[PDB]
């Protein structure tokens, strides 16, 4: 079990690692994780993941009450929706990472499972990835969709937006996010070449 | 309000962040920001954004008079044109960032709005992006075009060249630039795949 | 000859260099090298190549007995298969590097030589690259295939997975891996453009 | 005028900057620059540009006599050919940078001018880029071709290999190389889209 010290510390470090390696650019992205007391540690509003301050990270209750730190990111609203309908979720990584965001802008995505597996690792660690329709940023329908999907899915693709990825810790959610982004990137790299997709039996083996 | 200390400091740091992360390569790019006294702080001529010296950053008046530091970048000429016709502009980021430059070399661009929105963030923070025709570097027509566009547009695409992005601070202009470059990159990533563009009503919601 | 100090040190440094430069993401990848006593130094299970600890790197015998450090990566199983059938192999780099992994998901790969050479360097330093069929992670058939290929090939492409690259040291295996990944990347960059492949005589000159 | 101290220093720093930013991978690439005494400072054989040691950089005469430091890179042979037929050349950057190497593997390149300009900067700072046919590494025909081209061209594309870029200093040659690589990258980014190429009059303006 990690303390609030190390959790605040981990959040700053993970933010910097994501920013320096291109997963987050500019003002985009936010991180959250459950604290020991059941409250939420989150990156503050208008923040840059490469410039986080452990001391000023937001703390909010799952019901939306602001507890300490700078005012939370406005997207923490739909972070909470996930926590409130999945007790296994201890941390959420939300990014506009390039290829997962690209995938989110495509027409004709399978809304229940937008990544057709050709590598085993997303299946083992994440599972299927549903798609939330596009809505104006701040729309309550975003959080509503996530609350309904959270009991069955460990990650979510917000159409015309980007991924929302859960995990049993912040580092595990970050690893899940990096695995997802790498898989989305492989989609665009493979392009229209003939892909050796995983067979139906090969996908069932990985659960 | 930031002091000249911190402003010179911010410019060096932002330059290094842009250079290390690939937004600027070699000798390309320049930064400017309005000082408290109404003069312009700018990156010097023949400079490399990853090797800026706070102490030697150029200071020039909006009318072109060189005040302190190394001689300004020659492209500060069209930086000033923007400031002189947009009092909301406090900082300008000019880069040859790859995908915005690529977009600038295409034929058939909409000269009033070259980015057809499929994500909300460029619409919210920047708006439409006009295109300036290509002219020999140093041509006064570049600054002339920018002066005429500056009252209505917060960013500009110089054809066969690259973006010129304004902001209410250097960090905000850098975030706008990073958002624009990411959006241009998404264009080339999405390619000829069918894109779920934002509807006309979805674009009007974001102003 | 390097000591265990420097070998543990080299492994941590090489891991960090691969992680910071994008060759490894998240929890993916592992390194191994032969120690002076014939045992294997390897990166531990559930490890992140950018966060290795020299002091806790695993040590295992080539027959699978765990000797010191954290429990080895589960993929060290097929590392050992290579060592046990190639005495020239002193170090193995396994990554899910993007373009070699992409190449590994394609249909119709030549299973004996999946990289058709258009640059001399993979031929000089690595040679032909066979393809191992896809199998569920942990399948003994993976190690079996590698043991049979190891006497004739210095690198291997695990289908729907990624590269396994040998070398006379960890740095040489890393350089071989970087050369291979760059060559795989060139394949996807060149795309369907007409390539000046190396002639048959030009390939024979490089051995 | 820079001293040997600063020149050795600049070479190490420039190497690290090129390696960390992806222009050089593994064992590929070499740098050279003319010393005040007319001898050549060069990166040593089997070296990694991110791990250079100022103290052990090679010094060789333009006629090939090894003077100090580790044994020079074998590719310094064709570095010297350029110096011996262009007194304006004070530094040479040779890389296998991805997109310039990709361009070098294409069929049907214009051997006198392989980059059709759609941005002004390669024309202003480099000029036309000839193509040297592919030859086995170490072939004297490589140096022969470069010696014949050096009086008229400031950079050269070795087919199936990579760029060789001159400059009036190491930093200027590095900036030329970065500008060239960015232009080659734009070629592959633009792909088969209709490009607004620079007109014939627009290219003549830039000399
Ligand atoms: Cl926010
Ligand atoms: Cl300039
Ligand atoms: Cl493992
Ligand atoms: Cl060499
Ligand atoms: Zn978002
Ligand atoms: Zn410019
Ligand atoms: Zn693996
Ligand atoms: Zn070379």
JSON list of C-alpha atoms in Angstrom, two decimals, chain D:
[
{"chain": "D", "resi": 1, "resn": "UNK", "atom": "CA", "xyz": [37.49, 31.00, -34.12]},
{"chain": "D", "resi": 2, "resn": "UNK", "atom": "CA", "xyz": [36.98, 27.95, -31.92]},
{"chain": "D", "resi": 3, "resn": "UNK", "atom": "CA", "xyz": [39.80, 26.08, -30.17]},
{"chain": "D", "resi": 4, "resn": "UNK", "atom": "CA", "xyz": [40.35, 22.32, -30.16]},
{"chain": "D", "resi": 5, "resn": "UNK", "atom": "CA", "xyz": [38.88, 22.25, -26.64]},
{"chain": "D", "resi": 6, "resn": "UNK", "atom": "CA", "xyz": [35.60, 23.74, -27.80]},
{"chain": "D", "resi": 7, "resn": "UNK", "atom": "CA", "xyz": [35.65, 21.82, -31.08]},
{"chain": "D", "resi": 8, "resn": "UNK", "atom": "CA", "xyz": [36.05, 18.48, -29.28]},
{"chain": "D", "resi": 9, "resn": "UNK", "atom": "CA", "xyz": [33.38, 19.70, -26.88]},
{"chain": "D", "resi": 10, "resn": "UNK", "atom": "CA", "xyz": [31.00, 20.77, -29.67]},
{"chain": "D", "resi": 11, "resn": "UNK", "atom": "CA", "xyz": [31.39, 17.40, -31.38]},
{"chain": "D", "resi": 12, "resn": "UNK", "atom": "CA", "xyz": [30.43, 15.46, -28.24]},
{"chain": "D", "resi": 13, "resn": "UNK", "atom": "CA", "xyz": [27.46, 17.75, -27.55]},
{"chain": "D", "resi": 14, "resn": "UNK", "atom": "CA", "xyz": [26.22, 17.68, -31.13]},
{"chain": "D", "resi": 15, "resn": "UNK", "atom": "CA", "xyz": [26.51, 13.89, -31.17]},
{"chain": "D", "resi": 16, "resn": "UNK", "atom": "CA", "xyz": [24.44, 13.59, -27.99]},
{"chain": "D", "resi": 17, "resn": "UNK", "atom": "CA", "xyz": [21.81, 16.00, -29.35]},
{"chain": "D", "resi": 18, "resn": "UNK", "atom": "CA", "xyz": [21.52, 14.01, -32.58]},
{"chain": "D", "resi": 19, "resn": "UNK", "atom": "CA", "xyz": [21.33, 10.68, -30.73]},
{"chain": "D", "resi": 20, "resn": "UNK", "atom": "CA", "xyz": [18.79, 11.71, -28.10]},
{"chain": "D", "resi": 21, "resn": "UNK", "atom": "CA", "xyz": [16.50, 13.20, -30.77]},
{"chain": "D", "resi": 22, "resn": "UNK", "atom": "CA", "xyz": [16.52, 10.15, -33.04]},
{"chain": "D", "resi": 23, "resn": "UNK", "atom": "CA", "xyz": [18.68, 11.39, -35.92]},
{"chain": "D", "resi": 24, "resn": "UNK", "atom": "CA", "xyz": [21.24, 8.70, -35.05]},
{"chain": "D", "resi": 25, "resn": "UNK", "atom": "CA", "xyz": [20.51, 5.20, -33.79]},
{"chain": "D", "resi": 26, "resn": "UNK", "atom": "CA", "xyz": [22.89, 2.52, -32.59]},
{"chain": "D", "resi": 27, "resn": "UNK", "atom": "CA", "xyz": [26.35, 2.54, -34.15]},
{"chain": "D", "resi": 28, "resn": "UNK", "atom": "CA", "xyz": [25.34, 4.62, -37.20]},
{"chain": "D", "resi": 29, "resn": "UNK", "atom": "CA", "xyz": [26.70, 8.01, -38.13]},
{"chain": "D", "resi": 30, "resn": "UNK", "atom": "CA", "xyz": [29.90, 10.00, -37.82]},
{"chain": "D", "resi": 31, "resn": "UNK", "atom": "CA", "xyz": [31.00, 13.62, -37.50]},
{"chain": "D", "resi": 32, "resn": "UNK", "atom": "CA", "xyz": [34.10, 15.41, -38.71]},
{"chain": "D", "resi": 33, "resn": "UNK", "atom": "CA", "xyz": [35.41, 18.97, -38.59]},
{"chain": "D", "resi": 34, "resn": "UNK", "atom": "CA", "xyz": [38.55, 20.78, -39.72]},
{"chain": "D", "resi": 35, "resn": "UNK", "atom": "CA", "xyz": [40.93, 21.73, -36.94]},
{"chain": "D", "resi": 36, "resn": "UNK", "atom": "CA", "xyz": [42.91, 25.00, -36.97]},
{"chain": "D", "resi": 37, "resn": "UNK", "atom": "CA", "xyz": [46.05, 23.13, -38.12]},
{"chain": "D", "resi": 38, "resn": "UNK", "atom": "CA", "xyz": [44.24, 21.70, -41.14]},
{"chain": "D", "resi": 39, "resn": "UNK", "atom": "CA", "xyz": [43.85, 18.24, -39.64]},
{"chain": "D", "resi": 40, "resn": "UNK", "atom": "CA", "xyz": [40.52, 16.48, -39.22]},
{"chain": "D", "resi": 41, "resn": "UNK", "atom": "CA", "xyz": [38.74, 15.82, -35.94]},
{"chain": "D", "resi": 42, "resn": "UNK", "atom": "CA", "xyz": [36.39, 12.87, -36.32]},
{"chain": "D", "resi": 43, "resn": "UNK", "atom": "CA", "xyz": [34.27, 10.47, -34.31]},
{"chain": "D", "resi": 44, "resn": "UNK", "atom": "CA", "xyz": [36.09, 7.17, -33.71]},
{"chain": "D", "resi": 45, "resn": "UNK", "atom": "CA", "xyz": [35.30, 3.77, -35.16]},
{"chain": "D", "resi": 46, "resn": "UNK", "atom": "CA", "xyz": [32.50, 1.65, -33.70]},
{"chain": "D", "resi": 47, "resn": "UNK", "atom": "CA", "xyz": [31.35, 4.70, -31.75]},
{"chain": "D", "resi": 48, "resn": "UNK", "atom": "CA", "xyz": [27.88, 5.72, -30.62]},
{"chain": "D", "resi": 49, "resn": "UNK", "atom": "CA", "xyz": [27.12, 9.41, -31.12]},
{"chain": "D", "resi": 50, "resn": "UNK", "atom": "CA", "xyz": [25.44, 9.58, -27.73]},
{"chain": "D", "resi": 51, "resn": "UNK", "atom": "CA", "xyz": [28.53, 8.22, -25.93]},
{"chain": "D", "resi": 52, "resn": "UNK", "atom": "CA", "xyz": [31.41, 10.24, -27.41]},
{"chain": "D", "resi": 53, "resn": "UNK", "atom": "CA", "xyz": [34.52, 11.08, -25.36]},
{"chain": "D", "resi": 54, "resn": "UNK", "atom": "CA", "xyz": [36.12, 14.43, -26.18]},
{"chain": "D", "resi": 55, "resn": "UNK", "atom": "CA", "xyz": [39.51, 13.13, -25.14]},
{"chain": "D", "resi": 56, "resn": "UNK", "atom": "CA", "xyz": [39.51, 10.17, -27.55]},
{"chain": "D", "resi": 57, "resn": "UNK", "atom": "CA", "xyz": [38.01, 11.69, -30.70]},
{"chain": "D", "resi": 58, "resn": "UNK", "atom": "CA", "xyz": [40.16, 10.78, -33.68]},
{"chain": "D", "resi": 59, "resn": "UNK", "atom": "CA", "xyz": [42.51, 13.20, -35.40]},
{"chain": "D", "resi": 60, "resn": "UNK", "atom": "CA", "xyz": [43.60, 12.33, -38.95]},
{"chain": "D", "resi": 61, "resn": "UNK", "atom": "CA", "xyz": [45.24, 14.26, -41.79]},
{"chain": "D", "resi": 62, "resn": "UNK", "atom": "CA", "xyz": [43.23, 14.88, -44.95]},
{"chain": "D", "resi": 63, "resn": "UNK", "atom": "CA", "xyz": [45.53, 12.36, -46.66]},
{"chain": "D", "resi": 64, "resn": "UNK", "atom": "CA", "xyz": [44.51, 9.60, -44.23]},
{"chain": "D", "resi": 65, "resn": "UNK", "atom": "CA", "xyz": [47.32, 9.54, -41.65]},
{"chain": "D", "resi": 66, "resn": "UNK", "atom": "CA", "xyz": [46.05, 8.75, -38.13]},
{"chain": "D", "resi": 67, "resn": "UNK", "atom": "CA", "xyz": [47.33, 11.42, -35.67]},
{"chain": "D", "resi": 68, "resn": "UNK", "atom": "CA", "xyz": [45.67, 11.14, -32.25]},
{"chain": "D", "resi": 69, "resn": "UNK", "atom": "CA", "xyz": [42.75, 9.48, -30.48]},
{"chain": "D", "resi": 70, "resn": "UNK", "atom": "CA", "xyz": [40.95, 6.26, -31.25]},
{"chain": "D", "resi": 71, "resn": "UNK", "atom": "CA", "xyz": [41.14, 4.92, -34.78]},
{"chain": "D", "resi": 72, "resn": "UNK", "atom": "CA", "xyz": [38.79, 7.02, -36.94]},
{"chain": "D", "resi": 73, "resn": "UNK", "atom": "CA", "xyz": [35.48, 5.82, -38.31]},
{"chain": "D", "resi": 74, "resn": "UNK", "atom": "CA", "xyz": [35.98, 3.90, -41.53]},
{"chain": "D", "resi": 75, "resn": "UNK", "atom": "CA", "xyz": [33.57, 6.33, -43.24]},
{"chain": "D", "resi": 76, "resn": "UNK", "atom": "CA", "xyz": [35.98, 9.21, -42.57]},
{"chain": "D", "resi": 77, "resn": "UNK", "atom": "CA", "xyz": [37.58, 8.05, -45.83]},
{"chain": "D", "resi": 78, "resn": "UNK", "atom": "CA", "xyz": [34.81, 9.72, -47.81]},
{"chain": "D", "resi": 79, "resn": "UNK", "atom": "CA", "xyz": [34.64, 12.65, -45.40]},
{"chain": "D", "resi": 80, "resn": "UNK", "atom": "CA", "xyz": [38.19, 13.48, -46.49]},
{"chain": "D", "resi": 81, "resn": "UNK", "atom": "CA", "xyz": [37.27, 13.25, -50.18]},
{"chain": "D", "resi": 82, "resn": "UNK", "atom": "CA", "xyz": [34.84, 16.14, -49.64]},
{"chain": "D", "resi": 83, "resn": "UNK", "atom": "CA", "xyz": [37.34, 18.31, -47.74]},
{"chain": "D", "resi": 84, "resn": "UNK", "atom": "CA", "xyz": [39.99, 17.72, -50.42]},
{"chain": "D", "resi": 85, "resn": "UNK", "atom": "CA", "xyz": [37.73, 19.19, -53.13]},
{"chain": "D", "resi": 86, "resn": "UNK", "atom": "CA", "xyz": [35.84, 21.95, -51.31]},
{"chain": "D", "resi": 87, "resn": "UNK", "atom": "CA", "xyz": [37.79, 24.51, -49.24]},
{"chain": "D", "resi": 88, "resn": "UNK", "atom": "CA", "xyz": [34.50, 25.97, -47.98]},
{"chain": "D", "resi": 89, "resn": "UNK", "atom": "CA", "xyz": [33.73, 22.70, -46.17]},
{"chain": "D", "resi": 90, "resn": "UNK", "atom": "CA", "xyz": [34.78, 22.91, -42.51]},
{"chain": "D", "resi": 91, "resn": "UNK", "atom": "CA", "xyz": [32.59, 20.15, -41.06]},
{"chain": "D", "resi": 92, "resn": "UNK", "atom": "CA", "xyz": [30.68, 17.11, -42.28]},
{"chain": "D", "resi": 93, "resn": "UNK", "atom": "CA", "xyz": [27.70, 15.37, -40.70]},
{"chain": "D", "resi": 94, "resn": "UNK", "atom": "CA", "xyz": [26.99, 11.85, -41.90]},
{"chain": "D", "resi": 95, "resn": "UNK", "atom": "CA", "xyz": [23.87, 10.14, -40.57]},
{"chain": "D", "resi": 96, "resn": "UNK", "atom": "CA", "xyz": [21.48, 7.38, -41.50]},
{"chain": "D", "resi": 97, "resn": "UNK", "atom": "CA", "xyz": [18.61, 9.70, -40.59]},
{"chain": "D", "resi": 98, "resn": "UNK", "atom": "CA", "xyz": [15.38, 7.94, -41.33]},
{"chain": "D", "resi": 99, "resn": "UNK", "atom": "CA", "xyz": [13.69, 9.90, -44.10]},
{"chain": "D", "resi": 100, "resn": "UNK", "atom": "CA", "xyz": [16.86, 10.90, -45.93]},
{"chain": "D", "resi": 101, "resn": "UNK", "atom": "CA", "xyz": [17.90, 7.23, -45.86]},
{"chain": "D", "resi": 102, "resn": "UNK", "atom": "CA", "xyz": [14.41, 6.26, -47.05]},
{"chain": "D", "resi": 103, "resn": "UNK", "atom": "CA", "xyz": [14.68, 8.74, -49.90]},
{"chain": "D", "resi": 104, "resn": "UNK", "atom": "CA", "xyz": [18.08, 7.19, -50.70]},
{"chain": "D", "resi": 105, "resn": "UNK", "atom": "CA", "xyz": [16.51, 3.74, -51.26]},
{"chain": "D", "resi": 106, "resn": "UNK", "atom": "CA", "xyz": [13.98, 4.93, -53.85]},
{"chain": "D", "resi": 107, "resn": "UNK", "atom": "CA", "xyz": [14.12, 4.09, -57.54]},
{"chain": "D", "resi": 108, "resn": "UNK", "atom": "CA", "xyz": [14.10, 6.84, -60.14]},
{"chain": "D", "resi": 109, "resn": "UNK", "atom": "CA", "xyz": [15.73, 9.59, -58.08]},
{"chain": "D", "resi": 110, "resn": "UNK", "atom": "CA", "xyz": [17.03, 12.57, -60.01]},
{"chain": "D", "resi": 111, "resn": "UNK", "atom": "CA", "xyz": [20.79, 11.95, -59.59]},
{"chain": "D", "resi": 112, "resn": "UNK", "atom": "CA", "xyz": [21.60, 15.67, -59.86]},
{"chain": "D", "resi": 113, "resn": "UNK", "atom": "CA", "xyz": [18.84, 17.05, -57.62]},
{"chain": "D", "resi": 114, "resn": "UNK", "atom": "CA", "xyz": [16.86, 14.51, -55.62]},
{"chain": "D", "resi": 115, "resn": "UNK", "atom": "CA", "xyz": [14.80, 16.99, -53.58]},
{"chain": "D", "resi": 116, "resn": "UNK", "atom": "CA", "xyz": [12.15, 18.85, -55.57]},
{"chain": "D", "resi": 117, "resn": "UNK", "atom": "CA", "xyz": [11.69, 22.00, -53.47]},
{"chain": "D", "resi": 118, "resn": "UNK", "atom": "CA", "xyz": [8.36, 22.86, -51.83]},
{"chain": "D", "resi": 119, "resn": "UNK", "atom": "CA", "xyz": [9.98, 24.88, -49.00]},
{"chain": "D", "resi": 120, "resn": "UNK", "atom": "CA", "xyz": [12.64, 27.57, -49.45]},
{"chain": "D", "resi": 121, "resn": "UNK", "atom": "CA", "xyz": [15.13, 26.59, -46.76]},
{"chain": "D", "resi": 122, "resn": "UNK", "atom": "CA", "xyz": [16.99, 23.69, -48.38]},
{"chain": "D", "resi": 123, "resn": "UNK", "atom": "CA", "xyz": [17.48, 25.87, -51.47]},
{"chain": "D", "resi": 124, "resn": "UNK", "atom": "CA", "xyz": [18.82, 28.80, -49.47]},
{"chain": "D", "resi": 125, "resn": "UNK", "atom": "CA", "xyz": [21.20, 26.92, -47.22]},
{"chain": "D", "resi": 126, "resn": "UNK", "atom": "CA", "xyz": [22.13, 23.75, -49.08]},
{"chain": "D", "resi": 127, "resn": "UNK", "atom": "CA", "xyz": [21.16, 23.87, -52.75]},
{"chain": "D", "resi": 128, "resn": "UNK", "atom": "CA", "xyz": [20.77, 20.85, -54.97]},
{"chain": "D", "resi": 129, "resn": "UNK", "atom": "CA", "xyz": [21.47, 17.39, -53.56]},
{"chain": "D", "resi": 130, "resn": "UNK", "atom": "CA", "xyz": [23.10, 14.86, -55.92]},
{"chain": "D", "resi": 131, "resn": "UNK", "atom": "CA", "xyz": [22.79, 11.10, -55.53]},
{"chain": "D", "resi": 132, "resn": "UNK", "atom": "CA", "xyz": [25.75, 8.74, -55.34]},
{"chain": "D", "resi": 133, "resn": "UNK", "atom": "CA", "xyz": [25.01, 5.21, -56.60]},
{"chain": "D", "resi": 134, "resn": "UNK", "atom": "CA", "xyz": [24.97, 2.41, -54.07]},
{"chain": "D", "resi": 135, "resn": "UNK", "atom": "CA", "xyz": [28.28, 0.63, -53.52]},
{"chain": "D", "resi": 136, "resn": "UNK", "atom": "CA", "xyz": [29.41, -1.92, -50.96]},
{"chain": "D", "resi": 137, "resn": "UNK", "atom": "CA", "xyz": [30.45, -0.10, -47.75]},
{"chain": "D", "resi": 138, "resn": "UNK", "atom": "CA", "xyz": [34.15, 0.68, -47.97]},
{"chain": "D", "resi": 139, "resn": "UNK", "atom": "CA", "xyz": [34.18, 0.84, -51.78]},
{"chain": "D", "resi": 140, "resn": "UNK", "atom": "CA", "xyz": [36.60, 3.49, -53.03]},
{"chain": "D", "resi": 141, "resn": "UNK", "atom": "CA", "xyz": [34.00, 4.52, -55.62]},
{"chain": "D", "resi": 142, "resn": "UNK", "atom": "CA", "xyz": [32.05, 6.17, -52.80]},
{"chain": "D", "resi": 143, "resn": "UNK", "atom": "CA", "xyz": [34.88, 8.59, -51.99]},
{"chain": "D", "resi": 144, "resn": "UNK", "atom": "CA", "xyz": [35.57, 8.99, -55.72]},
{"chain": "D", "resi": 145, "resn": "UNK", "atom": "CA", "xyz": [32.01, 10.10, -56.42]},
{"chain": "D", "resi": 146, "resn": "UNK", "atom": "CA", "xyz": [32.05, 12.51, -53.47]},
{"chain": "D", "resi": 147, "resn": "UNK", "atom": "CA", "xyz": [35.36, 14.07, -54.51]},
{"chain": "D", "resi": 148, "resn": "UNK", "atom": "CA", "xyz": [33.91, 14.80, -57.95]},
{"chain": "D", "resi": 149, "resn": "UNK", "atom": "CA", "xyz": [30.68, 16.25, -56.56]},
{"chain": "D", "resi": 150, "resn": "UNK", "atom": "CA", "xyz": [32.18, 18.21, -53.66]},
{"chain": "D", "resi": 151, "resn": "UNK", "atom": "CA", "xyz": [33.17, 21.35, -55.66]},
{"chain": "D", "resi": 152, "resn": "UNK", "atom": "CA", "xyz": [29.56, 21.94, -56.71]},
{"chain": "D", "resi": 153, "resn": "UNK", "atom": "CA", "xyz": [27.34, 20.52, -53.96]},
{"chain": "D", "resi": 154, "resn": "UNK", "atom": "CA", "xyz": [27.12, 21.11, -50.22]},
{"chain": "D", "resi": 155, "resn": "UNK", "atom": "CA", "xyz": [25.32, 17.84, -49.43]},
{"chain": "D", "resi": 156, "resn": "UNK", "atom": "CA", "xyz": [25.08, 14.39, -51.00]},
{"chain": "D", "resi": 157, "resn": "UNK", "atom": "CA", "xyz": [22.71, 11.44, -50.83]},
{"chain": "D", "resi": 158, "resn": "UNK", "atom": "CA", "xyz": [24.43, 8.05, -50.86]},
{"chain": "D", "resi": 159, "resn": "UNK", "atom": "CA", "xyz": [21.89, 5.69, -52.40]},
{"chain": "D", "resi": 160, "resn": "UNK", "atom": "CA", "xyz": [20.73, 2.85, -50.11]},
{"chain": "D", "resi": 161, "resn": "UNK", "atom": "CA", "xyz": [22.67, 4.49, -47.31]},
{"chain": "D", "resi": 162, "resn": "UNK", "atom": "CA", "xyz": [22.07, 8.06, -46.15]},
{"chain": "D", "resi": 163, "resn": "UNK", "atom": "CA", "xyz": [23.06, 11.73, -46.29]},
{"chain": "D", "resi": 164, "resn": "UNK", "atom": "CA", "xyz": [26.47, 13.37, -46.17]},
{"chain": "D", "resi": 165, "resn": "UNK", "atom": "CA", "xyz": [26.09, 17.07, -45.29]},
{"chain": "D", "resi": 166, "resn": "UNK", "atom": "CA", "xyz": [28.75, 19.80, -45.24]},
{"chain": "D", "resi": 167, "resn": "UNK", "atom": "CA", "xyz": [28.83, 23.13, -43.46]},
{"chain": "D", "resi": 168, "resn": "UNK", "atom": "CA", "xyz": [31.00, 26.06, -42.46]},
{"chain": "D", "resi": 169, "resn": "UNK", "atom": "CA", "xyz": [31.01, 24.67, -38.91]},
{"chain": "D", "resi": 170, "resn": "UNK", "atom": "CA", "xyz": [29.77, 21.54, -37.16]},
{"chain": "D", "resi": 171, "resn": "UNK", "atom": "CA", "xyz": [26.66, 23.32, -35.88]},
{"chain": "D", "resi": 172, "resn": "UNK", "atom": "CA", "xyz": [25.90, 24.73, -39.33]},
{"chain": "D", "resi": 173, "resn": "UNK", "atom": "CA", "xyz": [26.36, 21.30, -40.93]},
{"chain": "D", "resi": 174, "resn": "UNK", "atom": "CA", "xyz": [24.09, 19.86, -38.24]},
{"chain": "D", "resi": 175, "resn": "UNK", "atom": "CA", "xyz": [21.47, 22.53, -38.95]},
{"chain": "D", "resi": 176, "resn": "UNK", "atom": "CA", "xyz": [21.78, 21.81, -42.68]},
{"chain": "D", "resi": 177, "resn": "UNK", "atom": "CA", "xyz": [21.35, 18.10, -41.94]},
{"chain": "D", "resi": 178, "resn": "UNK", "atom": "CA", "xyz": [18.32, 18.72, -39.75]},
{"chain": "D", "resi": 179, "resn": "UNK", "atom": "CA", "xyz": [16.79, 20.94, -42.42]},
{"chain": "D", "resi": 180, "resn": "UNK", "atom": "CA", "xyz": [17.43, 18.28, -45.07]},
{"chain": "D", "resi": 181, "resn": "UNK", "atom": "CA", "xyz": [16.00, 15.48, -42.94]},
{"chain": "D", "resi": 182, "resn": "UNK", "atom": "CA", "xyz": [12.90, 17.55, -42.18]},
{"chain": "D", "resi": 183, "resn": "UNK", "atom": "CA", "xyz": [12.48, 18.18, -45.91]},
{"chain": "D", "resi": 184, "resn": "UNK", "atom": "CA", "xyz": [12.87, 14.48, -46.71]},
{"chain": "D", "resi": 185, "resn": "UNK", "atom": "CA", "xyz": [10.38, 13.72, -43.95]},
{"chain": "D", "resi": 186, "resn": "UNK", "atom": "CA", "xyz": [7.92, 16.16, -45.51]},
{"chain": "D", "resi": 187, "resn": "UNK", "atom": "CA", "xyz": [8.18, 14.25, -48.80]},
{"chain": "D", "resi": 188, "resn": "UNK", "atom": "CA", "xyz": [6.96, 11.05, -47.16]},
{"chain": "D", "resi": 189, "resn": "UNK", "atom": "CA", "xyz": [4.38, 12.91, -45.09]},
{"chain": "D", "resi": 190, "resn": "UNK", "atom": "CA", "xyz": [2.92, 14.66, -48.12]},
{"chain": "D", "resi": 191, "resn": "UNK", "atom": "CA", "xyz": [2.82, 11.35, -49.97]},
{"chain": "D", "resi": 192, "resn": "UNK", "atom": "CA", "xyz": [0.66, 11.38, -53.09]},
{"chain": "D", "resi": 193, "resn": "UNK", "atom": "CA", "xyz": [-1.26, 14.52, -52.11]},
{"chain": "D", "resi": 194, "resn": "UNK", "atom": "CA", "xyz": [-1.11, 17.44, -54.53]},
{"chain": "D", "resi": 195, "resn": "UNK", "atom": "CA", "xyz": [1.80, 19.62, -53.43]},
{"chain": "D", "resi": 196, "resn": "UNK", "atom": "CA", "xyz": [2.21, 23.36, -54.07]},
{"chain": "D", "resi": 197, "resn": "UNK", "atom": "CA", "xyz": [5.79, 23.09, -55.30]},
{"chain": "D", "resi": 198, "resn": "UNK", "atom": "CA", "xyz": [7.96, 26.19, -55.52]},
{"chain": "D", "resi": 199, "resn": "UNK", "atom": "CA", "xyz": [7.85, 27.65, -59.03]},
{"chain": "D", "resi": 200, "resn": "UNK", "atom": "CA", "xyz": [10.99, 27.92, -61.11]},
{"chain": "D", "resi": 201, "resn": "UNK", "atom": "CA", "xyz": [11.17, 31.66, -60.41]},
{"chain": "D", "resi": 202, "resn": "UNK", "atom": "CA", "xyz": [10.61, 31.06, -56.70]},
{"chain": "D", "resi": 203, "resn": "UNK", "atom": "CA", "xyz": [13.63, 28.71, -56.68]},
{"chain": "D", "resi": 204, "resn": "UNK", "atom": "CA", "xyz": [15.90, 31.14, -58.53]},
{"chain": "D", "resi": 205, "resn": "UNK", "atom": "CA", "xyz": [15.09, 33.87, -55.99]},
{"chain": "D", "resi": 206, "resn": "UNK", "atom": "CA", "xyz": [16.76, 31.79, -53.25]},
{"chain": "D", "resi": 207, "resn": "UNK", "atom": "CA", "xyz": [20.39, 31.88, -54.40]}
]
